[PDB]
Structure 1
Amino acid sequence: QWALEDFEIGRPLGKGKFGNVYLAREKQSKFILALKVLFKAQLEKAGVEHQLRREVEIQSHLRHPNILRLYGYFHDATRVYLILEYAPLGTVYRELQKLSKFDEQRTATYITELANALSYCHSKRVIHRDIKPENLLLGSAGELKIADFGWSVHAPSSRRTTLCGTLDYLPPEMIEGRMHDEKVDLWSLGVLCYEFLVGKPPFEANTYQETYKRISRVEFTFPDFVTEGARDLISRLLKHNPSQRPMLREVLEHPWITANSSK
């Protein structure tokens, strides 16, 4: 049972669609953590309260080295605060802006830590449904951590996520409002793997309608530098039919993954 007075607040860490996440330290400990702030009026006006409940219940009951930790929460008259584990190395979005592209070793390592975290989620029938570079955080030893369980749910489901957000990481069945399962996170894993190596997602366009067309028709091409081992993995993950998508153990055991991942 914490309160705002139990914390010393520092600089902002990142911007959220419902308030910023700030760097903070607990007075009696000097322990460094992140405080996600959400404004009540915005939650109420949007009708996000039920999804915020799912975010807090699901995330707090997960324990994995590649998943961000949710310690607890508290609220006042105008805001809701989420006590998060601090990720010292920032996002994989920022790391991708610095390094225009990632090499095969970085990608295979990140995809390995990502598949390991998703298997733990999928073992509890939990699906993230919002895997994008801004929600992938780098912990103390440079390891990946899955954050923002804002759209996480228990499989199966049909709930609409982005009304007009980034469609780039969403599978065809999600953008079309169809029934979806664990296979949605496998599509996001392929888009992520393509983006890590190329610099941009495979269905990127300057119009929501063109992106919709390109993802529903699976219209993408690989630039010259993409290796046959990466081309195979990406093409296996990015299939229209969710049943034709591989299992997480086949991604972890893929020849191109095992040849470039850091044990």
Structure 2
Amino acid sequence: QWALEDFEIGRPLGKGKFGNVYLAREKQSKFILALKVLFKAQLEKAGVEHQLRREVEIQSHLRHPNILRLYGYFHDATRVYLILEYAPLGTVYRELQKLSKFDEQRTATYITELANALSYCHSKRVIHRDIKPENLLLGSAGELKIADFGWSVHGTLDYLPPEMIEGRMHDEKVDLWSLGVLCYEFLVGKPPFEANTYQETYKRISRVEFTFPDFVTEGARDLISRLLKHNPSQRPMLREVLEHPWITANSSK
């Protein structure tokens, strides 16, 4: 439906082994968006083609304010292009480096926003699995938008729950572990299972070994603790996460 000659590529926005994302503008529309340029060579070489059309599948059909729109896609001889909604305020990754930590009000807001985001996806039987700050963009509102459904289902272990890492029966409850991981990271500055090696992170995760800096308020600990349970079943429902008192007590939105 679209070709490259419909667009004007602007500033580079990012990297990621399979290519770069460039800001761009639709010629005849003046519309602003992010073009994610991916090569056919690299996608076949690193055996992924299958995952991509599943991203497009999922992300094309999804509709939520806290989920990065995928408007479409296309390709040529050399490469495949994904036409993505553009998120003015960049990644939450960046804002965490810049700010080192977030506060309880900013974290809970994001948590809420992310909760609702994830609440919608499970509804369509979809599991993200890869909720990490590098994957979380920001809109004009300053609002959280979950990008990238590369590893979505109907590398860095840091965000994966004990079940996935150990190679087991995994359900939509993985995303609550992630949310716990995310919540701690926002607050603390780094993930609760961070290690220097893959192998050590594996054990840290596999044995749910985390601890709280002193500044983490009591209710933060509580919500994280309930979310970071080795056994899926003990994990709150998204409802309960939204319902949690430290959330509501602090969750602006």
Rounded to whole Å, the distance in 1 between the matches of 2:152 and 2:37 is 19
Per the TM alignment, residue 175 of structure 1 is displaced from its structure 2 partner at its CA by 1.0
* Structure-1 separation of matches of 2:228 and 2:37: 35
Q: Which residue is equivalent to 2:134?
A: 134
Identity %: 100
Secondary structure at the residue paired with 1:182? coil
Aligned to 2:188: 198
For 2:22 and 2:175, locate their aligned partners in 1 and report how far apart those are by CA, in whole Å.
Answer: 28
Q: Distance in 1 between matches of 2:24 and 2:38?
A: 16
- Confirm or deny that 1:103 pairs with 2:103: yes
For 2:3, the equivalent position in structure 1 comes to 3
Map Cα deviations across residues 91-149 of structure 1 (whole Å, 9 max, x no partner).
00000011110011000000000000000000000011110001000011101000001
Q: How does 1:49-64 map to 2 (within 5 A)?
A: 49-64=49-64
Q: Distance in 2 between matches of 1:241 and 1:124?
A: 23
Aligned partners of 1:33 and 1:67: how far apart in 2? Answer: 15
Q: Could you tell me how far apart the structure 1 residues matched to 2:57 and 2:68 are?
A: 14
In structure 1, stretches of 5+ residues that fail to align are: 155-164
SS at match of 1:98: helix
Distance in 2 of aligned mates of 1:256 and 1:146: 23
Inter-partner Cα distance in structure 1 for 2:21 and 2:71: 15
For 1:19, the equivalent position in structure 2 comes to: 19
Give secondary structure in 2 for the equivalent of 1:225: coil
User: Does residue 260 in structure 1 map to residue 250 in structure 2?
Assistant: yes
Q: Residue 27 of structure 1: CA displacement?
A: 0.6
Count of residues in correspondence between the two structures: 253
Query: Which of 157, 161, 171 is matched with 1:171 structurally?
Result: 161
Q: Offset at 1:184? A: 0.6
1:79 Cα shift?
0.7
Distance (whole Å) between structure 2 residues aligned to residue 15 and residue 242 of structure 1:
34
Shift of 1:47: 1.2
Q: Quote how far apart the aligned CAs of 1:17 are.
A: 2.3
Offset of residue 256 of structure 1? 0.1
TM-score, length of structure 2 as denominator length: 0.99
RMSD: 0.6
Give the C-alpha shift of residue 232 in structure 1: 0.3
Please give the per-residue CA displacement for 1:213-256, whole angstroms capped at 9, x wherever unaligned. 10001011101111110000000000011111110000001000
SS at 1:47 equivalent: coil
Looking at structure 2, the residues matched to 4 and 57 of structure 1 have their Cα atoms a distance apart, in angstroms, of 21
Cα offset for 1:22? Answer: 0.5
In the alignment, the residues of structure 2 paired with residue 109 and residue 181 of structure 1 have an alpha-carbon distance, to the nearest angstrom, of 25
For residues 78 and 168 of structure 2, the distance between their equivalents in structure 1, rounded to whole angstroms, comes to 36
Q: Deviation string for 1:177-204 (max 9, x for gaps)?
A: 2121101111000000000000010011
- SS at 1:89 equivalent: coil
Query: How far 1:211 sits from its partner (Å)?
Result: 0.4
The whole-number CA distance in structure 2 between the counterparts of 1:210 and 1:6 is 48
Partner of 2:228: 238
Q: Structure 1: how far apart are the matches of 2:148 and 2:115?
A: 17
Question: Per-residue deviation at 1:29?
Answer: 1.3
In 2: Cα distance, 1:130 partner to 1:41 partner: 24
